[PDB]
Amino acid sequence: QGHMKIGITCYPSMGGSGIIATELGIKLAERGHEVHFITSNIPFRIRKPLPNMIFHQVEVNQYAVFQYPPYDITLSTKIAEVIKEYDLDLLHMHYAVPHAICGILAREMSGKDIKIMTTLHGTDITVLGYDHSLQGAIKFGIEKSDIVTSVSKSLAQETHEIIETNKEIIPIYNFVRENEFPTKHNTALKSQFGIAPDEKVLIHVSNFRQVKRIDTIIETFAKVREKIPSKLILLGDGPELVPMRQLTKELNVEEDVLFLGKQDCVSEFYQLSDLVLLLSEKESFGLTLLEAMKTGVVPIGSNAGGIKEVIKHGETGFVVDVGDCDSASDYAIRLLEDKVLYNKLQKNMLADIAERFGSELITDQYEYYYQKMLNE
Amino acid sequence: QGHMKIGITCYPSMGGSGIIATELGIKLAERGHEVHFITSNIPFRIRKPLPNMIFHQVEVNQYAVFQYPPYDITLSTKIAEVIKEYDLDLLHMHYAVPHAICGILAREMSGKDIKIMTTLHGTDITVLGYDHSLQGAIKFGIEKSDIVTSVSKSLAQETHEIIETNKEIIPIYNFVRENEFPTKHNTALKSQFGIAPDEKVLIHVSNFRQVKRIDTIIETFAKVREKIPSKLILLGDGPELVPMRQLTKELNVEEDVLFLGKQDCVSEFYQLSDLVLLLSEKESFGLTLLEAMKTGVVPIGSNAGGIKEVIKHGETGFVVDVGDCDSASDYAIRLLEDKVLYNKLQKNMLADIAERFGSELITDQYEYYYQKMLNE
Numbered sequence: 001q002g003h004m005k006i007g008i009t010c011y012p013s014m015g016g017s018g019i020i021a022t023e024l025g026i027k028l029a030e031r032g033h034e035v036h037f038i039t040s041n042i043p044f045r046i047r048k049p050l051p052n053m054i055f056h057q058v059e060v061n062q063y064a065v066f067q068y069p070p071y072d073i074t075l076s077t078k079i080a081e082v083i084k085e086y087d088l089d090l091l092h093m094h095y096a097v098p099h100a101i102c103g104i105l106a107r108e109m110s111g112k113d114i115k116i117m118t119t120l121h122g123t124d125i126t127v128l129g130y131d132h133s134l135q136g137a138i139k140f141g142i143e144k145s146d147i148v149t150s151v152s153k154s155l156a157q158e159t160h161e162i163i164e165t166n167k168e169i170i171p172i173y174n175f176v177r178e179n180e181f182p183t184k185h186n187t188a189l190k191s192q193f194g195i196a197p198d199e200k201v202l203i204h205v206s207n208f209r210q211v212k213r214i215d216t217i218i219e220t221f222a223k224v225r226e227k228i229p230s231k232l233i234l235l236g237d238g239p240e241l242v243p244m245r246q247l248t249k250e251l252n253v254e255e256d257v258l259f260l261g262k263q264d265c266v267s268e269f270y271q272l273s274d275l276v277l278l279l280s281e282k283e284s285f286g287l288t289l290l291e292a293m294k295t296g297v298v299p300i301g302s303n304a305g306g307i308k309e310v311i312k313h314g315e316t317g318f319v320v321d322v323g324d325c326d327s328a329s330d331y332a333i334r335l336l337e338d339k340v341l342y343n344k345l346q347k348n349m350l351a352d353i354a355e356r357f358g359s360e361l362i363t364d365q366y367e368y369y370y371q372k373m374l375n376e
Numbered sequence: 377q378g379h380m381k382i383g384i385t386c387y388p389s390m391g392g393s394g395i396i397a398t399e400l401g402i403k404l405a406e407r408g409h410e411v412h413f414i415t416s417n418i419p420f421r422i423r424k425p426l427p428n429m430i431f432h433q434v435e436v437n438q439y440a441v442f443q444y445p446p447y448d449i450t451l452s453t454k455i456a457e458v459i460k461e462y463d464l465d466l467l468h469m470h471y472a473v474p475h476a477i478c479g480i481l482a483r484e485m486s487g488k489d490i491k492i493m494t495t496l497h498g499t500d501i502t503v504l505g506y507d508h509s510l511q512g513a514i515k516f517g518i519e520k521s522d523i524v525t526s527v528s529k530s531l532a533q534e535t536h537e538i539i540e541t542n543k544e545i546i547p548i549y550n551f552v553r554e555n556e557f558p559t560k561h562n563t564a565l566k567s568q569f570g571i572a573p574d575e576k577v578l579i580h581v582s583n584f585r586q587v588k589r590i591d592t593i594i595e596t597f598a599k600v601r602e603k604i605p606s607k608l609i610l611l612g613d614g615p616e617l618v619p620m621r622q623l624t625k626e627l628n629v630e631e632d633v634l635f636l637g638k639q640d641c642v643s644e645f646y647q648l649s650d651l652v653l654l655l656s657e658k659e660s661f662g663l664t665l666l667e668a669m670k671t672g673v674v675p676i677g678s679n680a681g682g683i684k685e686v687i688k689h690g691e692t693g694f695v696v697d698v699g700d701c702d703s704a705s706d707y708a709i710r711l712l713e714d715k716v717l718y719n720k721l722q723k724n725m726l727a728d729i730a731e732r733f734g735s736e737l738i739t740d741q742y743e744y745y746y747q748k749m750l751n752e
């Protein structure tokens with residue numbers, strides 16, 4: 001037990017997973033562990049440099065000989081070079097593919113029997129939904145990792161179902177860094193963005209993929225809007241943006257839906273919101289829910305995946321069946337009309353997420369299993 | 377000794393290397409070995425199906441989760457699946473990167489201690505000329521292979537110099553399949569392509585990269601052309617095509633240089649040629665020289681790399697310093713004016729390449745080292 005030398009690999013900019021992996025490394029470095037990120041040359045935005053937190057980055061070039069940019073090999077070579085230069089104790093890889101495989105290859109290249117934790121975020125299920133070429137790679141990356149974790153219990157279950165492995169998968173929930181998301185409401189920025197100070201605000205934040213079911217979110221909002229003057233803020237960009245814009249026209253809510261594009265400072269938008277919606281068809285955890293909940297925003301989610309673990313239906317928010325804009329709008333109208341209900345769920349919610357998703361508690365759990373695999 | 381179950385991975389369409397790897401597999405399958413190609417979905421053009429020669433191919437898709445198409449992992453997974461399904465004895469990987477690494481990863485994924493031969497074609501030197509990110513991967517792929525071969529002695533020497541490894545590298549020359557390149561001259565197609573039946577023809581065949589020094593070839597031809605009515609045929613396409621077209625204008629040989637594009641049936645063009653030129657700055661072997669020489673075409677090459685092993689200066693052709701269009705044109709004019717010299721070099725050449733580069737002899741050498749590593 002004690003100080004560890006840790007190599008972390010993730011996609012630092014790809015959604016929730018990259019945020020989680022980065023914030024976890026920062027928490028570990030603030031405790032005094034020696035933390036090495038090894039990623040491709042993708043930006044990070046670290047605010048305070050630490051001498052014990054080093055970001056190693058690799059360029060993936062094509063050369064005229066490779067048919068494809070050799071990400072897996074270039075990354076594995078860089079991980080192995082950090083293992084040798086800094087005598088790393090363990091690797092923490094995010095995603096079975098490509099990153100568990102990269103860590104396994106880097107272990108071979110380094111000649112050191114380093115321990116490997118792999119954390120599953122749900123992308124390995126997504127890949128297999130498109131085609132089964134990688135079925136054997138995902139099974140191998142899971143089974144040759146020393147410890148495997150998943151960001152929800154639902155994801156651990158789904159993994160066993162789809163991958164067909166006896167490998168133990170440890171559910172360890174996601175978290176937000178509490179000082180990045182102060183619990184507070186602020187109406188100062190509302191006018192800037194064309195929202196009247198009193199107006200109710202519903203927010204959704206995502207990559208605008210079809211799996212997010214923004215169609216259900218806009219349909220929900222249209223039903224809300226005819227009872228309650230309100231705005232729907234949609235943060236992000238992606239494949240469904242134009243079809244969703246068109247949907248707001250067909251439902252006659254175009255002037256009330258704000259497509260604000262990608263935003264780095266999401267905290268300030270949660271601070272002006274009244275409800276957060278994540279009605280996804282598939283979702284291992286749902287980090288935007290937790291970011292909003294920590295801010296104090298009461299959530300409505302679907303019952304897909306881990307969302308029903310994040311939200312306690314009827315206690316800290318509401319959960320609806322996938323695609324049920326009737327029930328979602330019913331709950332939203334009640335929450336926007338009923339301050340007693342809103343205050344009660346919000347109070348329950350703030351206590352619950354402190355209890356189950358606090359950054360200190362989750363970091364302790366990862367740290368515990370780092371040490372467990374180092375002692376096996 | 378005897379029958380082997382062999383997995384071969386190469387880029388089937390990338391230059392000489394892909395031709396060599398494919399033709400070697402065909403030779404092995406014709407002997408009765410069980411030959412499995414495992415490549416990405418890149419065409420092959422096999423003329424006769426054999427029950428003991430199977431082409432496995434893998435799609436490399438992006439999925440929205442991978443930042444780069446995961447070639448290395450998808451290929452390694454497919455190799456491992458063939459190892460398990462067909463109980464392969466050994467892998468023959470072409471290129472230290474990516475393919476030696478893929479074979480090494482596939483060995484881990486398969487759970488079988490399969491033997492791995494890696495053949496170096498020179499691309500690993502080229503990659504490192506552009507940047508040194510992959511230095512450690514190339515060393516690892518070489519050192520963790522059971523046997524490493526190189527297509528020339530020059531390349532083995534260069535590898536030791538640049539990679540800094542004590543690993544034994546076995547020079548095994550390239551070959552052409554003799555019935556694909558009958559020794560014969562044919563003027564029937566000359567008129568079709570705007571060449572008078574008697575006109576002397578110089579040919580060059582390449583990927584039109586700067587390393588091929590087609591500028592030296594066109595400068596050589598311009599000096600030839602003012603003494604001898606003649607045509608320069610340039611087969612292929614690539615980055616230097618437009619600058620080379622412009623060069624033929626500046627030298628006033630535009631009407632005498634035929635840019636014929638990429639050609640699959642190169643044999644028919646060698647059959648109408650009088651000289652072949654390969655004046656490359658870097659070149660591990662120079663397969664187009666051997667294809668032309670087997671056809672009966674006398675070569676002029678540079679002294680780079682393995683070209684001076686393929687050509688015996690003054691005996692089976694001529695070798696010049698890189699960029700020396702003065703000497704190259706001097707030799708070319710002599711060969712095109714002097715049938716005694718031409719016939720003598722051509723006779724020496726046809727005997728020499730039968731002795732050192734015959735397909736049966738080279739296949740025997742690969743087969744010998746397959747068996748050697750299976751017995752170690």
Ligand SMILES: O=c1ccn([C@@H]2O[C@H](COP(=O)(O)OP(=O)(O)O)[C@@H](O)[C@H]2O)c(=O)[nH]1
Binds near residue numbers: 016262264
């Ligand atoms: O404009 C945006 C959109 C998303 N996110 C962040 O992206 C994460 C998860 O979003 P996403 O839909 O991209 O992927 P998934 O949640 O499915 O991982 C959350 O931390 C968001 O705060 C952000 O910062 N700005």
Ligand SMILES: O=c1ccn([C@@H]2O[C@H](COP(=O)(O)OP(=O)(O)O)[C@@H](O)[C@H]2O)c(=O)[nH]1
Binds near residue numbers: 392611637664667
């Ligand atoms: O139009 C062409 C150009 C090249 N090649 C073949 O490509 C190989 C080697 O060519 P390249 O310059 O592409 O690569 P390198 O020789 O450097 O490997 C030889 O077998 C050629 O016959 C071909 O078949 N048709």
